[PDB]
Design a protein around this ligand. Sequence first.
Ligand SMILES: *[C@@H]1O[C@H](CO)[C@@H](O)[C@H](O)[C@H]1NC(C)=O
Lengths: 189, 178, 13
Amino acid sequence: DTRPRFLEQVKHECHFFNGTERVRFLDRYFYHQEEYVRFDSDVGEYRAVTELGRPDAEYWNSQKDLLEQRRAAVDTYCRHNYGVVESFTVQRRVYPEVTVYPAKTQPLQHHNLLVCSVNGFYPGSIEVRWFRNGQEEKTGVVSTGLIQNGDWTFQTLVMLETVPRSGEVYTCQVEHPSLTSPLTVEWRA
Amino acid sequence: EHVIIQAEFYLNPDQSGEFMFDFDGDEIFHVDMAKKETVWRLEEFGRFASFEAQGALANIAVDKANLEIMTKRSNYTPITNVPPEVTVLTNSPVELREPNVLICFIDKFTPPVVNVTWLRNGKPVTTGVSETVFLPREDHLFRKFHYLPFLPSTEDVYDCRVEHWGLDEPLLKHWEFD
Amino acid sequence: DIFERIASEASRL
Ligand SMILES: *[C@@H]1O[C@H](CO)[C@@H](O)[C@H](O)[C@H]1NC(C)=O
């Protein structure tokens, strides 16, 4: 199929700062990826983003009834929906399962990678640190970064490049909003 | 800071529309346009809230009407295909014979039309598969997830096969037990 | 506990 495609998108965005203390509503219209007109509650009128949107900003800005609907949205729409969802979104807290397993950077002979697998958590902000004998190890650390699972959970792997020696204690430490103190998992050769 | 977005789209000539709500990058729900039903991304959401799915159809009708106007206004300038990036991962560390889930993450593409097949040992598998709708990105491309629960073995290999009009050939992303 | 949708604005022909 090579028939040309045409895409319209609309994003009605509600931005919250300190709960509902400060709220910004952004009504955004797109043709393919090009935002062409928007309503910003900071302005209170539509503005053309590109020349493609100038006819809509002129026309819609001429209709005071339309504008007052948009001007009310921070209250009637944003703050209302925030109230509806806040308890299972803003306040959602799922703590991570933490697994530590050894691996190899390339097929070698000896495991030379310690993987700290941090799975199933929400929200996304997390701090994962590696320790050797209680001193933090900051060199040779690499990660997948933060991975969305698409189901309201995240995961991340944080790997330490090291040749483990007997007598060494390795600790992966996880800090996350769902936790009241750091989660630590130990590993020994 | 949190962000709630009501994201809509309408695509010609496919005449496909979508209506969903997003919280901080995760889908709260979308409207099944054919059934006119609200589909909560987690079941527990539907016990805490409701949404009159019928009203999503009004938005899509306006968006279809706006698309015809903008298409004409643009002198019929069509979309440029952006092919996806594809990643295959599991949602937990893999243990032999311990049930797990393969995730196929399809990212950074447009238009929002894709064919995705899970292959086990080169053969399509459909038992137990699920998927998300097209999810919006802040750069106004799309992303999507497909899922395959599975029993990890040494004798099975897997691929996520993605077809998209911006790809020259299907993109196959492999997974096997290390 | 009812989600509110906001209307999309209609361009003129
Ligand atoms: C479409 O063509 C008209 C007539 O040449 C021109 O004025 C207008 O700028 C064009 N618009 C776009 C988006 O190409």
